[PDB]
Design a protein around this ligand. Sequence first.
Ligand code: PRO
Ligand code: PRO
Ligand SMILES: [Mn+2]
Ligand SMILES: [Mn+2]
Ligand code: NA
Ligand code: NA
Ligand code: NA
Lengths: 484, 485
Amino acid sequence: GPSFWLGNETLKVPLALFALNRQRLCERLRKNPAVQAGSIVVLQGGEETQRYCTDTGVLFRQESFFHWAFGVTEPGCYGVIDVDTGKSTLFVPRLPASHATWMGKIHSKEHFKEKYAVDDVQYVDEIASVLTSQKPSVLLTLRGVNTDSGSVCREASFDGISKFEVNNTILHPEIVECRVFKTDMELEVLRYTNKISSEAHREVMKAVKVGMKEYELESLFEHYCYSRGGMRHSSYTCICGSGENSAVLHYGHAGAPNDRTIQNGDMCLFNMGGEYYCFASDITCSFPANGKFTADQKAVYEAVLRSSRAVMGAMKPGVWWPDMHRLADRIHLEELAHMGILSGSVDAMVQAHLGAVFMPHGLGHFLGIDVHDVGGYPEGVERIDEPGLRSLRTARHLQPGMVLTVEPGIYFIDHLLDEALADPARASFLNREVLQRFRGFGGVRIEEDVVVTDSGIELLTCVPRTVEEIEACMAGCDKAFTPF
Amino acid sequence: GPSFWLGNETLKVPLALFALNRQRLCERLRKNPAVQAGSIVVLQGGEETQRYCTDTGVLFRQESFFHWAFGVTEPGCYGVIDVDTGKSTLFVPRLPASHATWMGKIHSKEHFKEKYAVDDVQYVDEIASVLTSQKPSVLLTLRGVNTDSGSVCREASFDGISKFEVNNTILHPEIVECRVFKTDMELEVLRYTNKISSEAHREVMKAVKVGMKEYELESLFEHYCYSRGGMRHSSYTCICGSGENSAVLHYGHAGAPNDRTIQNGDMCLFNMGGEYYCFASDITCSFPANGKFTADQKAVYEAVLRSSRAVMGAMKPGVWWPDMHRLADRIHLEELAHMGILSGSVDAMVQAHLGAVFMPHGLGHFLGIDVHDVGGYPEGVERIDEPGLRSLRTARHLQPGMVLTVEPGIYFIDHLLDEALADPARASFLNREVLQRFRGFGGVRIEEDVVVTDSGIELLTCVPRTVEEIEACMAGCDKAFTPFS
Ligand code: PRO
Ligand code: PRO
Ligand SMILES: [Mn+2]
Ligand SMILES: [Mn+2]
Ligand code: NA
Ligand code: NA
Ligand code: NA
């Protein structure tokens, strides 16, 4: 069958990937006792957008559920799936003649049918007529709440949909559940996104020099990913935190835009991941700007390396993700105590939620077509109302086929440290005089992407991780990849 | 005063630039008869967005009118200007404590006052109270139609605005008019955007090799612009058209995503422009993929070079922009005839609108904070209802301070050629035996950015342009070129 490919050494992604997703969705819907025979799934793709009121086009990136089902890159499409037969129909815009001048070839419907390996292709303006002739019992549309954004998924609509019976409740939990479990074809894509992003992280580690701006490495990362990987998009805005900025979890956005000069003695925390054909990667590397860990940097870094590998070593089916988060907290506390930042009973520190002062985010999250992938909190799975754990993006137990980030970190965040020092239940553990030295340190995060297997995990990421490996990487002369 | 700067060799942009824009807007409004004492201009900044229903943040780029007035890079702001006094107040979001963990320092209002050199800073939720205390006669908000997109500008609104008198008709044409005329401080920024984008285009010409994907050069261009220029955004999606894709005017979008392999013998048409602090650039370079122009390529290329230079030489205050478009059309037709593609009377060709077959877009457009900048068709300026000319993004007369692209091109577009061949009024001019050779050629576009001055123009762009200069650049021989004067 056909494949998506951006040539050179980029990955060929078979369109059969999306056919399998459609089949899996139908199989799941058929088993749902509420689903009527003759149902049709109706999804609406993303549309082209512009900046504000201008004609400045925004580069189009497909809506994630639509992509998962169809792999379609063009704006303005719809797609439907007959549940009982699995038959797929793509609806594409009927373009005006002037499109050939301004935008490119006006492809035939047959071109799209071949390209996407769907059963039929029709024009968008005929959607009501086509669906009417199919005589469906009900249209199943997409509406639900994303548990990371709190946004409501946009339900498909078209002129004449009011003449059909529409259900917008059944589909969302079923298609979400399908997305939670990655097929072998999807895993091949995620191995590739991890491979390219890993290579780009290594190039960044080799290129970092004291005196550079953070954004110079953002630029280099994205250039490697696009030119060598065919990754036109990143999975999220690059986080290139140097010095104290490494304590800011989503640093790099427009309000704090990777604009600090990297200084001798800084730690760097670079959390970046290219996106290929709407599939994510999400990797964090932490390292000294000057290529040599100080004693304090080594101690904090190796604490996080310890939790990283302890969590990865414990992960397997049946493990409760919140238990892995707590495992990381306990390790961090043990190590911070060894360093002299903390004193006293680690059991008591855990009871006082001290771990969350140093790791005020979730241990990690599902990853797929979105970096914070869907399905972390389906109905019946509750968010734990405690510091740190409440920021977990899933409280599920692990099962084969899930893809997770494993991203423990330790940070020195003044307002959290100050709150802890004011609370007698936590202050007794904190040694102010030692902690003082780490004010402004920033933090360390080590983030791998892994797949749960029948017996454990498969690690997708491949970057240097021990202190020696990182120092050796940064000292290498190779000068492969030299723009200009 | 304070400046925006991204360090290294990037441009320091004084925040005084935006203060001057506010002053100019107030000065214009004070002379406007529809404007009464005690009016306050109220603008709403852009807000943070995410991809669809996900939590994947989209990188925030400020709304252009708001940027022009305030230069503010943060999402969620509003800004007001007292017309009578010129006093400026910026409203910034009141952030949650958790912002300090996830997003960064929760800066004080005073930090923002100093950063932006405004007269006062307040929190957004206090806007109704703050405006109430000022007892304004009327709030002047933004609403109008963009003449390139057809979209309606987003008018400011806040909880309690219904208790004020609001006028949404006065402001738009006035702030648009201010934007049309660039200040010296704005020209400094546009000189810089052109400098960086020109350097990037030269790096791309040096790097292009047969067998590369078009997108490899998009990537290299954007990397030069960001890493060396501090340009986090491009002004528009890069157009990297090789071979027949060079005939597709806005090639490179998601439906045609710069994914062709460049072949020996192809022409390349690369239309790319970095954006710095929301100021545009827009440059097009055309060149042979293999670094050596064939005779046919040289002929088409030099025809567009001739029109480019003729227009730049004729541009000065008082010139009607559609007359420049017609000049380019006439030159293209003359040169296509000199190449044997066309024969007959060029006057007759012009009368039959044959130029538009080969250049089915406008000669050029205003440029500023938007690549297709505002104000090309103010009330009373009409679109010319002819092929080619109807795509002009302005029909105004040139005046000092305007910034224009000059972007003639010649393309070989099958459905347009075939229409002409089916039209007795046009068909006899075309020599099919020669034209057949140019089917699939794509096209050539040569685009400079210029400022209208008292004397003529100031050319902002600095890239190789003659065949000899381009061939030298591609061979690695950079800077071996002299700009037009
Ligand atoms: O948002 C999250 O869940 C993780 C935490 C560190 C950065 N990304
Ligand atoms: O849109 C326009 O007006 C010009 C034409 C060629 C590319 N940009
Ligand atoms: Mn992550
Ligand atoms: Mn242009
Ligand atoms: Na990018
Ligand atoms: Na992360
Ligand atoms: Na252009």
